[PDB]
RNA sequence: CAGGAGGUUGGCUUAGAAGCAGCCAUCCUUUAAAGAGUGCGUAAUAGCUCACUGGUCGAGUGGCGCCGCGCCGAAAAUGAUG
């Protein structure tokens, strides 16, 4: 789910990781699988 | 050796369509359809959350009895609890008249955590807020 | 948050007298080993019966309370149970069997004080 | 590695680490070395082992916890070994032991076979269940995942090779 | 890593909230501090993590009133480069 902003965490148990340059958001929920690159 | 599971019925009603089906039928039980039995003990006591030692032996001993309902409910029920149909906002003449609160919060205070000497001075803080009157 | 309060009151609830002990009992939901812990108002009367300040917080707060430094339970969990708050004369026998006749290693105790010195852990249970 | 520093009790095997490349602790059959970095020179000591840092720069305190916990797990496995266990559900299809590699019946229509590395550890004591053991830990996990990589997930329905402590979900399909 | 003391057991709905179905509730006992009980949920429950802790352990860990420098947002048409 590549949005270029709106990487604001919404599932209340997600958390944000930077890795190899990109920004990923990982919850325990496959609906929210954001990455902004 | 038969283990017990903690439950609670509805309060006031007797029907056990789902209550006496898969709920208890899952762990272990016997015979069901206790309209006859739950009206024999539900009607004489309870509008106020009634919890009795739920035993699942073989439905041989008639239930009926009736344990003294717990604290907040058996203080706060006889106002009507009339609202709730629309939205939650402690309305519908939810005024209870504190003297009536004392005569519902009255002799029936036997079984609680180690004491309650008077439930119309300190337990009313739980009762009135949980009902809606702040 | 806590800085001037807490201790200034948990040590006051521990220093009503000098006949405390230690305690720990832990795993279930709240009211029926509040049977044992709150029917320390039955075997006693509303005592700070493990009112549970902390340890290391109570351990360098009890210098300010000056209760002889009963530092035995720097090991496995310390309550610093102040059984002297209502009646510390016979409540130890009622508090030992409350955790003894239950699930395995229910209520472990640590140190104890016999109102003038520190009582031993091997003689506190017996 | 901690908020402070930690002792590393050592038994059975010894140490050494004179080459500098990687320090070592092998037990009865253990010769598992570790490729540890340059300086952060570890100290050879008595029956307990500790570790250093020259400062609190976010290079040295980054290497610090890895430098401890990459020796602290090397000292443990060479005397008993690690293990990882592997459950497998299904409607009647199991693994067997034709040689020392292992077959499976999933939809190649008879055979699925995969070969283990030098840490060979096939052992079946049931009917379909299997577990992997050995000396290492970084290569136990990838072999116990290469076994998983054949018919790995299960989405709608209870099937599939699993792990042991996973509560893996379900959701209905047509009706239910 | 070890632990979550049940009067917290609905008010409509009780076919079912017992925080963890659809609605605010902003109390008390007592102790490992409290869960006015944040999440996974089905028929409620069952249980698990810490959003609390004592244990364990011991000294640099959670946000910013602001700046200095950087990162993704950034796709062409004969072979490339400041």
From Swiss-Prot, chain A:
<comment type="subunit">
    <text>Part of the 50S ribosomal subunit.</text>
</comment>
<keyword id="KW-0862">Zinc</keyword>
<feature type="binding site">
    <location>
        <position position="27"/>
    </location>
    <ligand>
        <name>Zn(2+)</name>
    </ligand>
</feature>
<dbReference type="InterPro" id="IPR000473">
    <property type="entry name" value="Ribosomal_bL36"/>
</dbReference>
<protein>
    <recommendedName>
        <fullName>Large ribosomal subunit protein bL36</fullName>
    </recommendedName>
</protein>
<keyword id="KW-0687">Ribonucleoprotein</keyword>
<dbReference type="Pfam" id="PF00444">
    <property type="entry name" value="Ribosomal_L36"/>
</dbReference>
<feature type="binding site">
    <location>
        <position position="14"/>
    </location>
    <ligand>
        <name>Zn(2+)</name>
    </ligand>
</feature>
<dbReference type="GO" id="GO:1990904">
    <property type="term" value="C:ribonucleoprotein complex"/>
</dbReference>
<dbReference type="GO" id="GO:0006412">
    <property type="term" value="P:translation"/>
</dbReference>
<dbReference type="GO" id="GO:0005737">
    <property type="term" value="C:cytoplasm"/>
</dbReference>
<keyword id="KW-0689">Ribosomal protein</keyword>
Curated annotation (Swiss-Prot), chain B:
<dbReference type="InterPro" id="IPR020784">
    <property type="entry name" value="Ribosomal_uL11_N"/>
</dbReference>
<keyword id="KW-0694">RNA-binding</keyword>
<keyword id="KW-0488">Methylation</keyword>
<comment type="function">
    <text>Forms part of the ribosomal stalk which helps the ribosome interact with GTP-bound translation factors. The stalk extends beyond the surface of the 70S ribosome and is preferentially stabilized in 70S versus 50S crystals.</text>
</comment>
<dbReference type="GO" id="GO:0070180">
    <property type="term" value="F:large ribosomal subunit rRNA binding"/>
</dbReference>
<keyword id="KW-0687">Ribonucleoprotein</keyword>
<keyword id="KW-0689">Ribosomal protein</keyword>
<dbReference type="GO" id="GO:0006412">
    <property type="term" value="P:translation"/>
</dbReference>
<comment type="function">
    <text>In the 70S ribosome is in a position where it could interact transiently with the A site tRNA during translation.</text>
</comment>
<dbReference type="InterPro" id="IPR020783">
    <property type="entry name" value="Ribosomal_uL11_C"/>
</dbReference>
<protein>
    <recommendedName>
        <fullName>Large ribosomal subunit protein uL11</fullName>
    </recommendedName>
</protein>
<dbReference type="InterPro" id="IPR006519">
    <property type="entry name" value="Ribosomal_uL11_bac-typ"/>
</dbReference>
Swiss-Prot record, chain C:
<dbReference type="GO" id="GO:0005840">
    <property type="term" value="C:ribosome"/>
</dbReference>
<keyword id="KW-0699">rRNA-binding</keyword>
<dbReference type="GO" id="GO:0006412">
    <property type="term" value="P:translation"/>
</dbReference>
<keyword id="KW-0687">Ribonucleoprotein</keyword>
<keyword id="KW-0689">Ribosomal protein</keyword>
<protein>
    <recommendedName>
        <fullName>Large ribosomal subunit protein uL10</fullName>
    </recommendedName>
</protein>
<keyword id="KW-0694">RNA-binding</keyword>
<comment type="subunit">
    <text>Part of the 50S ribosomal subunit. Forms part of the ribosomal stalk which helps the ribosome interact with GTP-bound translation factors. Forms a heptameric L10(L12)2(L12)2(L12)2 complex, where L10 forms an elongated spine to which 3 L12 dimers bind in a sequential fashion.</text>
</comment>
<dbReference type="GO" id="GO:1990904">
    <property type="term" value="C:ribonucleoprotein complex"/>
</dbReference>
<comment type="similarity">
    <text>Belongs to the universal ribosomal protein uL10 family.</text>
</comment>
<comment type="function">
    <text>Forms part of the ribosomal stalk, playing a central role in the interaction of the ribosome with GTP-bound translation factors.</text>
</comment>
<dbReference type="GO" id="GO:0070180">
    <property type="term" value="F:large ribosomal subunit rRNA binding"/>
</dbReference>
Curated annotation (Swiss-Prot), chain D:
<dbReference type="GO" id="GO:0022625">
    <property type="term" value="C:cytosolic large ribosomal subunit"/>
</dbReference>
<dbReference type="InterPro" id="IPR000702">
    <property type="entry name" value="Ribosomal_uL6-like"/>
</dbReference>
<comment type="similarity">
    <text>Belongs to the universal ribosomal protein uL6 family.</text>
</comment>
<keyword id="KW-0689">Ribosomal protein</keyword>
<dbReference type="InterPro" id="IPR036789">
    <property type="entry name" value="Ribosomal_uL6-like_a/b-dom_sf"/>
</dbReference>
<dbReference type="Pfam" id="PF00347">
    <property type="entry name" value="Ribosomal_L6"/>
</dbReference>
<dbReference type="InterPro" id="IPR019906">
    <property type="entry name" value="Ribosomal_uL6_bac-type"/>
</dbReference>
<comment type="subunit">
    <text>Part of the 50S ribosomal subunit.</text>
</comment>
<dbReference type="GO" id="GO:0002181">
    <property type="term" value="P:cytoplasmic translation"/>
</dbReference>
<dbReference type="GO" id="GO:0003735">
    <property type="term" value="F:structural constituent of ribosome"/>
</dbReference>
<dbReference type="GO" id="GO:0019843">
    <property type="term" value="F:rRNA binding"/>
</dbReference>
<protein>
    <recommendedName>
        <fullName>Large ribosomal subunit protein uL6</fullName>
    </recommendedName>
</protein>
């Amino acid at each position: 789910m590549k949005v270029r902003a709106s990487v604001k965490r919404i599932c209340d148990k997600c958390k944000v990781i930077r890795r190899h340059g990109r920004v990923y958001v990982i919850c325990e929920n496959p609906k929210h699988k954001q990455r902004q690159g | 050796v038969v283990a017990v599971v903690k439950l609670q019925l509805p309060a006031g009603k007797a029907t056990p369509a789902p209550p006496v089906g898969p709920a208890l039928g899952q762990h272990g039980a016997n015979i069901m359809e206790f309209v006859k039995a739950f009206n024999a003990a539900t009607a004489n006591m309870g509008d106020a959350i009634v919890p009795v030692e739920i035993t699942i032996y073989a439905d041989r001993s008639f239930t009926f009895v009736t344990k003294t309902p717990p604290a907040s409910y058996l203080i706060r029920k006889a106002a009507g609890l009339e609202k709730g149909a629309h939205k939650p906002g402690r309305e519908k003449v939810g005024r209870i008249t504190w003297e009536q609160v004392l005569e519902i919060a009255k002799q029936k205070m036997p079984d609680l955590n180690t004491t309650d000497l008077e439930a119309a001075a300190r337990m009313i803080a739980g009762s009135a807020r949980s009902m809606g009157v702040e | 948050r806590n800085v001037e309060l807490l201790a200034t009151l948990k040590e006051n609830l521990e220093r009503a007298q000098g006949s405390f002990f230690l305690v720990n009992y832990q795993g279930l939901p709240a009211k029926e080993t509040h049977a044992l812990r709150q029917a320390l108002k039955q075997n006693g009367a509303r005592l700070f019966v493990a009112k549970n300040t902390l340890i290391r917080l109570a351990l360098k707060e009890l210098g300010l309370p000056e209760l002889d430094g009963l530092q035995g339970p720097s090991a496995v969990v310390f309550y610093e149970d102040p059984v002297a708050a209502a009646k510390t004369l016979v409540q130890f026998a009622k508090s030992n069997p409350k955790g003894i006749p239950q699930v395995k290693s229910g209520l472990l105790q640590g140190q104890i004080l016999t109102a003038k010195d520190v009582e031993a852990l091997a003689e506190l249970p017996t | 590695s901690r908020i402070g520093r930690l002792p590393i009790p050592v038994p059975k095997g010894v140490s050494v680490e004179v080459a500098p490349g990687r320090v070592k602790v092998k037990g009865p059959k253990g010769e598992l070395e570790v490729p540890v970095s340059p300086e952060m020179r570890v100290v050879v000591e008595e029956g307990v082992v500790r570790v250093e840092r020259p400062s609190d720069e976010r290079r040295h305190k980054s290497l610090h916890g890895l430098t401890r916990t990459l020796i602290a797990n090397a000292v443990k496995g060479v005397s008993e070994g690690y293990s990882k266990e592997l459950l497998i559900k299904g409607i009647g299809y199991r693994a067997r032991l034709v040689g020392r590699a292992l077959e499976l019946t999933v939809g190649f229509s008879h055979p699925v076979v995969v070969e283990p590395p030098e840490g060979i550890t096939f052992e079946v004591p049931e009917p379909t269940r299997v577990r992997v053991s050995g000396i290492d830990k970084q290569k136990v996990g990838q072999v116990a995942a290469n076994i998983r990589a054949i018919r790995k997930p299960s989405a709608y329905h209870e099937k599939g090779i699993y792990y042991a402590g996973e509560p893996v979900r379900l959701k209905p399909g047509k009706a239910g």
